[PDB]
Design a protein around this ligand. Sequence first.
Ligand SMILES: Nc1ncnc2c1ncn2[C@@H]1O[C@H](COP(=O)(O)OP(=O)(O)OP(=O)(O)O)[C@@H](O)[C@H]1O
Ligand SMILES: Nc1ncnc2c1ncn2[C@@H]1O[C@H](COP(=O)(O)OP(=O)(O)OP(=O)(O)O)[C@@H](O)[C@H]1O
Ligand SMILES: [Mg+2]
Ligand SMILES: [Mg+2]
Lengths: 38, 377, 175, 413, 167, 370, 283, 144
Amino acid sequence: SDQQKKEELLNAMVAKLGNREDPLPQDSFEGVDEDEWD
Amino acid sequence: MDSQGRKVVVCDNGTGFVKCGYAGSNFPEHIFPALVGRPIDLMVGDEASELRSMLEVNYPMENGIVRNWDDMKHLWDYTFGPEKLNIDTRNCKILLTEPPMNPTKNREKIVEVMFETYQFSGVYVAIQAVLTLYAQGLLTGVVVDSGDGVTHICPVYEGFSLPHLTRRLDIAGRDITRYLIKLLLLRGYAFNHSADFETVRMIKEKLCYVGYNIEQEQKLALETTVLVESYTLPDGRIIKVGGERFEAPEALFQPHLINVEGVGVAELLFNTIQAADIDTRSEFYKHIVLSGGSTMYPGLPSRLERELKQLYLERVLKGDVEKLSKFKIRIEDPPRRKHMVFLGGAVLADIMKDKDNFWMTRQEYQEKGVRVLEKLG
Amino acid sequence: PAYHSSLMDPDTKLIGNMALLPIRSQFKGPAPRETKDTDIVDEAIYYFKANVFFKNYEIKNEADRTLIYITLYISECLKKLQKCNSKSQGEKEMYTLGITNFPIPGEPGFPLNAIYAKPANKQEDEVMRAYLQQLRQETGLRLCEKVFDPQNDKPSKWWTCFVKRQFMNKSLSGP
Amino acid sequence: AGRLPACVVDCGTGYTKLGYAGNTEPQFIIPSCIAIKESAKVGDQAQRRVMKGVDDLDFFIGDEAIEKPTYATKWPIRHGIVEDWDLMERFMEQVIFKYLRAEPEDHYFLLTEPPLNTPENREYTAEIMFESFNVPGLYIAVQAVLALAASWTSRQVGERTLTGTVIDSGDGVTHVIPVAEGYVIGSCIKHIPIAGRDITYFIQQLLRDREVGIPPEQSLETAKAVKERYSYVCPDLVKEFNKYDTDGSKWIKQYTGINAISKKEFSIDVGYERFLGPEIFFHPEFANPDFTQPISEVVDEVIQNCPIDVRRPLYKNIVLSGGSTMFRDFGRRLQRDLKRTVDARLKLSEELSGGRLKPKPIDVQVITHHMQRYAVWFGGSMLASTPEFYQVCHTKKDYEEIGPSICRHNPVF
Amino acid sequence: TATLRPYLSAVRATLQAALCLENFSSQVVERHNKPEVEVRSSKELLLQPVTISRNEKEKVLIEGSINSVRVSIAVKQADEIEKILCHKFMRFMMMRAENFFILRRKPVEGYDISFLITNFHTEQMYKHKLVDFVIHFMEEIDKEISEMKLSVNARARIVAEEFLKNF
Amino acid sequence: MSLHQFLLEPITCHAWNRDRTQIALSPNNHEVHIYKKNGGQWVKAHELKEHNGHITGIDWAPKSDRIVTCGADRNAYVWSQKDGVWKPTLVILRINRAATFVKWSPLENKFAVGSGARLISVCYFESENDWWVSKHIKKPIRSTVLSLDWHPNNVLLAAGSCDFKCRVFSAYIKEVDEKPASTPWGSKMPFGQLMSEFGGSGTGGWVHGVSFSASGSRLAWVSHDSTVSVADASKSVQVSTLKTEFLPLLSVSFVSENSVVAAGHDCCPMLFNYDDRGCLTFVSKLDIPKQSIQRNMSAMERFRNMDKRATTEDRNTALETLHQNSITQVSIYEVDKQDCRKFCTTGIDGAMTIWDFKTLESSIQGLRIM
Amino acid sequence: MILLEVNNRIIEETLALKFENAAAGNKPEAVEVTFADFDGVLYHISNPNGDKTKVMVSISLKFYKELQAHGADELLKRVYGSYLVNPESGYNVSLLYDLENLPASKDSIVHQAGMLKRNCFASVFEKYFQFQEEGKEGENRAVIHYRDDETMYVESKKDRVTVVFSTVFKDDDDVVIGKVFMQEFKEGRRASHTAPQVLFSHREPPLELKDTDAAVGDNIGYITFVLFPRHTNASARDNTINLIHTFRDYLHYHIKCSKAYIHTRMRAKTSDFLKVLNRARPD
Amino acid sequence: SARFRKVDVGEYDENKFVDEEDGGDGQAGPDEGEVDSCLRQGNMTAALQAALKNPPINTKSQAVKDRAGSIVLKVLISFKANDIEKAVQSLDKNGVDLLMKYIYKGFESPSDNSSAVLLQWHEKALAAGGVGSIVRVLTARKTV
Ligand SMILES: Nc1ncnc2c1ncn2[C@@H]1O[C@H](COP(=O)(O)OP(=O)(O)OP(=O)(O)O)[C@@H](O)[C@H]1O
Ligand SMILES: Nc1ncnc2c1ncn2[C@@H]1O[C@H](COP(=O)(O)OP(=O)(O)OP(=O)(O)O)[C@@H](O)[C@H]1O
Ligand SMILES: [Mg+2]
Ligand SMILES: [Mg+2]
């Protein structure tokens, strides 16, 4: 029974993981100015 | 060649190819693919097929029955043009083929298109199993056909097809290819169902066969390394195919592996033959002819004869062993299974060319209309 | 990808497949005078630091051949500016570099014989040699103030780190 | 101590990540090198020493293997593919019994594999884990599905699918991998031969060209520190040279290092190599003279060779992974170049159609998430912590009667 | 010691006579090439089985046919450590049976290892080199097992002395 | 002793033309290669590709120049040359098992195919409707037929099979042949009549090769139990049997009235003598070991080297015979069965060897072939 | 390596990184680490109520009720002192470190934090050596269920201290390899004469454990250590306790290393057979 | 379903190979009295030549073949090592083939030190008779 165990595992993955609203680690570095990125 | 000087043209319209020639020829003159191309004005035939990238393609006929009528009309005026045949359509006799279990409205439409649009002098249509038995030189037998869509079992007796005994099984080569894709996915190789159809089709055409006794092949698979072969992918990787070579075509005999209800092909053939009349059963058992593209596996008629003998032992003699030597069967496969339908049509057009009752006349079509089609029987 | 010029105007004359672009100079030559602020030399100096890393250049016009020639000559300028230490013998070195001859197209010493079209007759040869000499002297005199750094009166380390790089693995002087 | 967590080990060309399940970060990150004693004669397999005593236990793994006198340093993995199995087994001996300190008869195990792996390597790994250490369970996972599962933390609950394109970049070979419904389309995986070693070599030869005062033994670690600390991705090239030439007080940094043999300090200036480092992803002919194709054309050729009905979900979900994709403004540059190529193709098709066809404009998204540096380990750690994992993992019993063939195929997530 | 060379000479003389193979197609099922010692359909294509015994434990069994031959070897095992090392070594060789081309995945019952040789192998290789490989294999196994046993004992002495020193 | 190495993969079978200038052979696959001698070297001239299975039999007619091929795909083809292009013609065999052997008739009007379906097929040509038809001989064959030979009077046939017997059949077809004469084998000749059956009782060996003599009154055959047998029909059909002390033989040929040349798994041809009284004796090996193997690596020194091998036995890296593997086909190369001076051998190692009687008479002491 | 280590590695590296960050005055960071050890011991490193200035280490053992009956609380109070606090929920022993009140020396605090499990097991041995030092008799044996199937027995006499291990081998070949290793342990007093006496029994318990309900089975083996007053005094008891409680893992580690050496040794013979077989072709 | 697939119909075929038998069961093998007398008076060569007479190759009973093998292996294990090659060279070809058949039957049930004696007899019979005798052992339909 690969498919039923795998879809229960996928439902566990969907119901398990939460969300984060913290700033990214890339934002702490210094880079080029914002307004010419278009 | 007749007394009136109207030539007889045999035109075979298979799904993959269209072949054409004259009556009495031992080889087809002209072979084309069936294709209609549109650029992204309208090229039909060979010349659409080399110039493939510019032209969007269209297949007009699917499983022997036509789907788009004007594309088949353009195919017909491509074949009857001056570049390939160069014949006069008002002074010709034409023979055509039809797939079995054909609905009657399609046959009426084909006969109406031949008699009204192109104005042919003589039109006949015939079932392909009778043409196959004419190519073999027989008159009575059972024809088992297996292509790409379905599998048909049809008996022909005294040169005519029996309509109420023709049977259909919905297992063909694409199901075996999908089952081989699943069996190759179960060994760890990464494959996709839509992107990798042609490669597994070439593997199935190259390596698979039909096993005689299942326990001997499974013992050889789990004990020896004899059956292991190697194949090279177009990317460059080398894969090893082992015991799937006999497991892939086993869905024809055990349909429950591919989640299809019903019985196998041997039980269907036994129930087809045993439902006929009692006095003609001995003629049907001695003339069984295999045809089609899916019947080219090695070891198929030995397995079919063994399953027929086991069914006849169980369900007729009811356990008597001594009467089994009197039961005689013979399954004949041709070694010339390239153009059997064209050769049978050419033999039938050659021998039956001057007698009046065979050809359907244009004057009776003008008198009656769609009532001439009862004279086929 | 690579950076191309944008100074092409169809009233301009051609010497073979060159472009007779106007220049601003005090040296004598056959080039016409330029009224605008920019010219081909300032664009070559502008695009040298990005064009020197490339190895596959695609020709789109006639002025790009002239841009390729000035970009090839700037590395030969930077080889001579490596050894020098003060300004005024810097211009005395670059004048003597600009005086001496170089292989023209049509000669076997020229590296890009396949793309560059050979000149036909003798006055075309004279006009081509005078035009290349004027371009040579003007880009030397323009590079003399840009390379040198005024507070120390030394060649700058940011300009002298581009010596070993070659444009399309080519060289005007060769090995 | 009723239930013990599983152990997650992820090996690689450059670094090995190892820890316990249920956590967010790995407990150990070590280099994948082994120092063994080679006091015997060089280049003689017959004279390769019989261990009369315990002389095969005289070795060091990890960061202790780097620069040890009277020892030889070996790297067992080339491009994600194991070449020496003896060194791999001796590596796993000191992984299990020294760092993790776990009894292997009580813990389940999860291991990772390269994307194109033969089943014989899976059989060899199952032999090493089941015959020598006697584990009760083993599961071998695919890295792309773990990265696609680990990218769900920046996403809402209604949009979590398992279809996308994974761009993986480490110390070996950059991979572009399409994943459709949890299964890898194996005929469309493409390779770009640019990674962090080429960037470090390019920065090292630039610093050899410009600066002076660096010791010759410490050039590579200095180039690695300059690459990891001061680097970004620029939109244009000549404007950055104009910014550095006009105003050099802001954009030019200084780096201070310590000499190892003299205990003295040196200082260098970091200039043009801040932006010229990561630009070889988009211009591969700067360093490698053979490969002349940017990464966006490789991604577009991966997606355009796929089947037609899954072509539009692949554009909507592009997931970055690996340690070499940690430069700033990577995804914006990749998204801009991919959108330019796509819009050029549809305006060319609209010009050649002449108003016959009006295709809808597609949506291209490049996803940057939090757990980008350790995405495969995070996906394995969040897979192994659930109670449903123990019904999917293999057992030692199925190795005992059925054999090594159970580990050729795993239930693909 | 004195029985070893006549045993190997008799095994070499028996394997020379049983390796005269020939290509043959199946007369039961059309378009099939099968090894006849495994299917055993036709009884006229089989030869008599033979065996050679050195003592009550060591023996070699040889079975032949028209296009195939099977050799089964029983290995000397003195005690418990030798038989578990023999079992590990035979399992280690029979897992890699696809690289050898002449090895069976499972042995015949009552024996330790079996070889199956068909006519394609003697078309691709020489006969006497195959006979030499069989005799060289039977010679090298016992020396390998004795060296492994001595290595295990010499390791265990050093481990015990290293633990009891520091206490 | 002329050796030529054609190719590394094995040679299944070979055939010569009339003038012995071209050769046709199968390189262990489904194609037939025709080589032509140009100058002093062999070059490839033609390739024939029509079959779908393993080629098992090639034969070349000397007069009409037609090549018959049979394979393991239950098919047979007749090839004829037109404008430098060889063209095939299909033969309907009506068999459900693979074919093993094919031989032309002496008058080139029919041919015989031995197959694995316990029957022998005799095929001739019908010219009113223009194709090749076949007839079957079935009883009392019980196994696979491995070898065939034709009598020189174009009627009788000899067959050997895996049921440990050698049989003589009659193959007379009224549409093609004429009325035959009387023979010592028999007097009544309808189609399919069994004339004589030979074989040992209780001693089972598969018969690999049969051969007739030049006059046609003597028969010889070889078996798998290392026996050579000669049957004489005139002296009330007596059978003489000799048990050798070597490996089994796979080919046999009469080279005169009283001499037999055979070859097999011992890699070297051997000579046997048959006198008028009825005693079969072994004479010599025709592959005398090279140029003595240099006094057999100095006769006293290899006896001391066998003492050295009694100390340390090591194996020979290359066999001393001119074939490194088995020999499967022996053929007569010069003139015919009445006068033989040279003969040709092919083998599994992929080489072709030409031997001469006069050089072997000059080299081997006391050797005399008649 | 040959001998196993005593102190943990995760705790020492984590606490050294946190103390080196807190020494320089940088901003602290959160931490939440859960892991395990030998013989089914759980660990936890976390922050109390989200406060980032405090770290907290807790342990979890199954058999703390047996060790508490022999007085393990007073030894932990004597070793640690003010760092010992009330336990966490679901855990047995808990420590607490404040980052604002650290001492100047930091190696000894991290080193005592690494040896928490040895400080848990040391109390039974330190109790039972004192009975041999004082000359008492008639005291009951100490029975420790340190695993589910394995048992440690400690007994004291006038001139000997007897430590009996019961162990279970899970596989059949491990019994033979362990018999070889314990035969070499039994014979191994021929070089060192101050070595203790080691005895081994297979499938049956020893005589002095006749009264207890000791298991009888094919996999179960019994190991006896005899200790003398040259090892149990007040100056050489630390390395004795550090060596006697890490013996079973040492034995199973060397068994698995021997099997891995055997699997290393087979591959060269397989490669030589493949080379000899591949030389036979006429390529 | 699949009840009919269990029946093996291949061995009910008429055209399968059936072995042919000849001779009765009246051959009782060699007689024990003369070989016991030749062992008693010490004539070893006469004991070997009288033991090889009357082979029971046609009798389908097992006990006659077992007692004939018992007498032949009783004679063969009572020789000295230096009297073997004189006894081997006194035979013709059929005696060498029958001795090779009895030696290869004697390897089935080893006991005590008979295998070294059988290996010496195998070496001398191989030196006298060649490798064709082993092929005639392997291809025999009726076995002693
Ligand atoms: N040698 C082969 N072995 C097995 N299968 C084969 C072989 N050659 C072709 N096939 C299969 O046979 C099928 C083709 O059958 P066929 O040539 O009769 O096609 P068709 O004319 O399009 O079919 P149909 O008339 O049923 O519509 C395909 O499924 C192909 O894979
Ligand atoms: N900002 C950065 N932070 C960390 N590492 C960086 C950074 N920029 C570049 N790198 C490089 O990232 C590399 C780490 O790659 P990674 O850990 O993914 O390797 P791997 O073991 O090959 O991984 P994989 O399992 O994905 O194949 C180092 O070589 C390092 O130089
Ligand atoms: Mg079809
Ligand atoms: Mg990597």
